[PDB]
Structures are given as C-alpha cells and as structure tokens.
C-alpha cells in the first residue's frame, strides 16, 4: 500500500495472508468470507506468463495477523486448503478479467476479536455504494513504494473513479467486471495498493446497517501510485452468482 498508514489492531479482521511454504514468503492478500472460505484474486494462483500455478499443497493461509513477518503466537491461525476454485473464464491472456478465486479451508477457523468474516454485497448495497466519489478501503502488507515493505498491515481509503476516466488512463481493455479507484493527479491526495497486495479486499462500510462489505478484490495497476494511473479491482458483486454456485455446490 503506498501512502497508507498502519492499521489498528482488529481493524480488518477479515484480512488473510496467502503464504507459500518453500520458500516461506507472502504471496498475496485474501479475505475471510465464512469460517471455511477465503476469496482472493485468481492471478495469485495461476499466471502462466510467469509460470505461476499453485496447488492446495503449496499454500498456507494465515488469519488474524497484523505484523507481516512474525508468527503471532496465540493470535493468528494458519489453515491448509482443501480445494481452490478459479473462475472458469478468468482471462490471464489479455486483461485479467474475472480475476477471482475461492479457497476452501481444510477445517473451519474459529473467530476471535482478530478473525471475523466480511460481508459480500447484495444487488442493492452494490447499487447504492459503488458510486464515483465514494471511498473504499484497501489493506495489505504489499510494497510501500513501486521501487521498503511494512512491518504491520497498512490501510488506505481511496475514492471510486468514473469508468471513462479509468478507461482513458490505460491501453488495457476494461470490462464491466472491474472498477478502478484512486485520486486524480489533481486531488493532491495519493494512495494505491502495490505489489504484494494483490488478492486482498477493497471494502466499504454500509451507512444503512453499519456492516463492512467487500466490493472489490485488488487485481492490478501499472506501477504503484503513478499520477494519472489508478488501481483496478475485480467487481465482486458482478461475480457473485459464480461465488454462490461454488459455495453451495461444494
């Protein structure tokens, strides 16, 4: 996260860390949506251009963290995966369209003051909050600059940008399964997710029922916090039927 600050303890109790077993490293961010399911970005698990194709056996999920490198004994839980589901039409060849994956944990995790799931939006909450100008929050342990790394979880609140502005900032083809967020060069405010934050959550707090909803998944951006550029996120509500389907099917 660039130009974001340290998170508070228990601020994003749904933040998950995808950890690789050997080498032991942070792979991506993810979020806890139930006691057995985690949602992340599919490019964190499968990205052929760079020979990335992880299986159940190569990842570990760490929930309840704050600190990036320490094993927070008695606070965090580490779960193993049972199955990984990548959206059938995830497009890695061209623009990372439908960059979403679900991971089923081996065993349910117990919630605590540090582990609690986020809500997935329903048509009406999506419709009322995903508006240009409304701010959302992104969290992660990713890089602090494009070109070090934080010791603690970082948070940044970014405004959602109008789609034409998003499209006119890149040469990549934007689809309706993506949205972009960030400040204009012109708003003398900065912030963006960056490398290491892919897969994590973009959430908004409903002013109707005070709950936090995960509207997006950190997907991509060109550089980190470059002026004139924005971060793109997968549109969770547009892929919600796929989500509902693998959950009640599996």
């Amino acid at each position: 996260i660039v130009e974001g600050s340290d998170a508070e303890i228990g601020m994003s109790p749904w933040q998950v860390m995808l950890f690789r077993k050997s080498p032991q490293e942070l792979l991506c961010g993810a979020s806890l949506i139930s006691d057995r399911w985690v949602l992340t970005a599919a490019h964190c698990l499968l990205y052929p251009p760079w020979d990335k194709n992880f299986t159940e056996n190569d990842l570990l999920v760490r929930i309840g963290k704050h600190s990036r490198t320490r094993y927070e004994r008695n606070i965090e839980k580490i779960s193993m995966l049972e199955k990984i589901y990548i959206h059938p039409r995830y497009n890695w060849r061209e623009n990372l369209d439908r960059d979403i994956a679900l991971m089923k944990l081996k065993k349910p995790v117990a919630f605590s003051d540090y582990i609690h799931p986020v809500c997935l939006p329903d048509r009406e909450t999506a419709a009322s909050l995903l508006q240009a100008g409304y701010k959302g929050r992104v969290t992660g342990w990713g890089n602090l600059k494009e070109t070090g790394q934080p010791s603690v979880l970082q948070v940044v609140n970014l405004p959602i940008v109008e789609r034409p502005v998003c499209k006119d900032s890149t040469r990549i083809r934007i689809t309706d399964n993506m949205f972009c967020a960030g400040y204009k060069p012109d708003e003398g405010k900065r912030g963006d997710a960056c490398e290491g934050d892919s897969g994590g959550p973009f959430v908004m707090k409903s002013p109707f029922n005070n709950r936090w909803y995960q509207m997006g998944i950190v997907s991509w951006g060109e550089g980190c916090d470059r002026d004139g550029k924005y971060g793109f996120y997968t549109h969770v509500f547009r892929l919600k039927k796929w989500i509902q389907k693998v959950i009640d099917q599996f």
Binding site: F19, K21, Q24, L60, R68, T69, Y71
Partner: peptide
C-alpha cells in the same frame, strides 16, 4: 525475513 512458523503447519 519471515520468522519461522511451527512445523505442524507444513507436515
């Protein structure tokens, strides 16, 4: 940079 995590989580 990452501290060691308990062996029971590798197996």
């Amino acid at each position: 940079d990452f501290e060691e995590i308990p062996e029971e989580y590798l197996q």
